[PDB]
Ligand binder design. Structure first.
Ligand SMILES: O=c1[nH]c(=O)c2nc[nH]c2[nH]1
Ligand SMILES: O=c1[nH]c(=O)c2nc[nH]c2[nH]1
Ligand SMILES: O=c1[nH]c(=O)c2nc[nH]c2[nH]1
Ligand SMILES: [Cl-]
Ligand SMILES: [Cl-]
Ligand SMILES: [Cl-]
Lengths: 273, 273, 273
């Protein structure tokens, strides 16, 4: 029955907001939740009410899907995501991503907060992801394949769509907002990484490290939903500075990064309208 | 009851083909399924009918065990394997390998199709595996130990038997068929690897990358079944060429590689008869 | 109900030994089990009788908790641990560690036997751990967070307490016992590592490799229990010598290492009394 959930999600969403045809899906991580306040003609749906969507174990911290118009683009925005560290496995974002796909989104704009493995890319920066290295155990597609959504095996050669990256690089350049491209390393968490793990990630070629992104990106590649993913850098990774990592610390720099992050998103959306 | 399955498999196989005493076990991966057509005095058993053997989730694509004589050697050939990405865990090949052991095979000849991490080892090549690096989560032997089959802890120093490798290297040299030796890196799949993951695998010392081999090889080391393993290279690994990876692409070069792969297997078997 | 087990463990332990107020917790791995013989005013409790404590699958090899006075310090010593390879997941040491915490221990002294990734650190040596790289799948804290014990996210910057390391380095220097500091790499097991895996671990910056430590250390960091961890080197890691790895081989050098290991522990305890 897990496999049917996106079809039920679609029927539910279509009944709540008849007529609505989203063009772009968003996943809103730390610092970017507030972007939903800018959506007009909006409808908000609790994840508790949408089949297959993640429900947090923390009382009062369940996410919401916001549907509406943003900068001339019809969007469906997940305010909140599920993570591998929640204990529901790597497939925790597969049904939501398939729901974006079936709703007709042309692509997914994934956002998250994370640490920089490069000392010269500082807290408060935004980075555009160009590839990943997965260190979470397994992948979301382990298990029987649902061929309704995609093939048993699939290439990750364009997992972070090349043309969307070129589109956004042009926007950043127009805005004079620095936007490096980096390789994302996933980590299971929910502890932050040790300093030795961070040095390992540098050795194997990582630029950014975090606890999300990979599950939803792999689920998207499987069902052929294009992805662009940008990250708010909230700290240099463990061992690279003397800052104490904590969710409070994360949220501090996520707020900072959100100022330019929002300018990039708005200009990008206006360019797609 | 999972632990008893090989004893039931043996009783079943012995009833279907009384008298048969296999000398060598094979696991036949992509391109090498057709080798079963060369077996004489053959009996074929659907995996569905053998306790503990893997049954695919894909309608009509269940494997078969073929018992008979090949080039003067009594063999038992698994046409098809189970993989970690099927979602039954790392132990999906443990009962079949224990079945080879209890049936009396002197060793296991493992075959698979995979990508080359070395640009100079080209698609259509055959490589002999000499060691592995496991990146799948856990190992097949996680869980209580079945001491009927092997010890709680076990060395992997000769996981790809040294003397069998020397035997096969002599065969390849006699035949003038190039046969490099390589370190195999396992990957969970069922996505292919990203280009950054491939560079990571090069950095850590890999030569070949694929989605099988390790589970059955670790299960074999535990129960003391010797292993020789050869791989058909079906592509350079992701990012090392501009080919699009897909199962169709795999099968294309598996057919090519199978020509020399079969010559090596036949000469090797004649040398053991 | 898993989450309540440490509270039940505490009530049970307090009833069996009313009044007892441990200052330091120990986990006793290979070669160091015998240290419990030196505890006075001792009480011994089978793990079978303590809620949440690990019970081995091997008949007759269940561990025991020993409570008493050692070198002027009230201690609670786990003689035996649970491991990831037992198949109960990464959380197999979480309840025992939380039990140490609730009992009031000021820190945990973790001990284990393991392989050296450095050829110049020889079998029979003792190493003090300063950091780790986890290669086991996931972490003990994957799943809903029990905020009674610690936060959803947590830093590993001081996972091997810096001041305890300085304390012990002074002891080793006073005793003229060599004590290098090393990065520990965890491995799922229960196979030992391949030679290629060992070279990978050297490449990524490891100094010592073993099948425990990480689960209990991460559980301790989550609930804020300070850790000092020392390792008995029982072999150079696979491929670095011609010794055959086996539990028998491990136990051989664990006995050797235990002589200086015990001197270090005794002097360290006297310094804390
Ligand atoms: O895994 C992570 N590592 C970090 O450094 C970080 N910062 C924010 N979020 C993060 N996640
Ligand atoms: O994991 C894999 N990587 C590849 O490049 C490949 N080619 C065939 N089969 C393969 N499996
Ligand atoms: O994973 C391990 N690797 C080893 O070399 C070793 N020696 C003792 N115990 C060990 N565990
Ligand atoms: Cl985030
Ligand atoms: Cl194959
Ligand atoms: Cl130990």
């Amino acid at each position: 029955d897990f496999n049917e959930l996106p079809f039920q999600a679609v029927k539910y969403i279509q009944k709540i907001k008849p007529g609505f045809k989203p063009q772009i899906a968003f996943i809103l991580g730390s610092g970017l939740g507030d972007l939903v306040d800018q959506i007009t003609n909006d409808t908000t749906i609790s994840y508790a009410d949408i089949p297959g969507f993640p429900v947090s174990s923390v009382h009062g911290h369940a996410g919401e899907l916001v549907l509406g118009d943003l900068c001339g683009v019809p969007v469906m925005c997940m305010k909140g995501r599920g993570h591998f560290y929640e204990g529901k496995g790597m497939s925790i974002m597969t049904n939501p991503v398939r729901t974006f796909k079936l709703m007709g989104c042309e692509f997914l704009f994934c956002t998250n907060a994370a640490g920089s493995l490069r000392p010269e890319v500082l807290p408060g920066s935004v980075v555009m992801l160009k590839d990943h290295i997965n260190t979470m155990p397994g992948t979301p597609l382990v298990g029987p394949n649902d061929d309704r959504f995609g093939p048993r095996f699939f290439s990750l050669a364009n997992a972070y769509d090349k043309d969307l990256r070129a589109d956004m690089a042009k926007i950043a350049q127009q805005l004079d907002i620095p936007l490096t491209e980096g390789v994302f390393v996933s980590y299971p968490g929910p502890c932050f990484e040790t300093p030795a793990e961070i040095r390992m990630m540098q050795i194997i070629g990582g630029d950014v490290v975090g606890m999300s992104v990979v599950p939803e990106v792999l689920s998207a590649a499987h069902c052929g939903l294009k992805v662009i993913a940008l990250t708010a850098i909230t700290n240099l990774a463990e061992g690279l500075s003397d800052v104490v990592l904590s969710h409070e610390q994360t949220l501090k720099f996520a707020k900072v990064a959100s100022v330019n992050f929002t300018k990039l998103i708005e200009a990008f959306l206006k360019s797609k309208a």
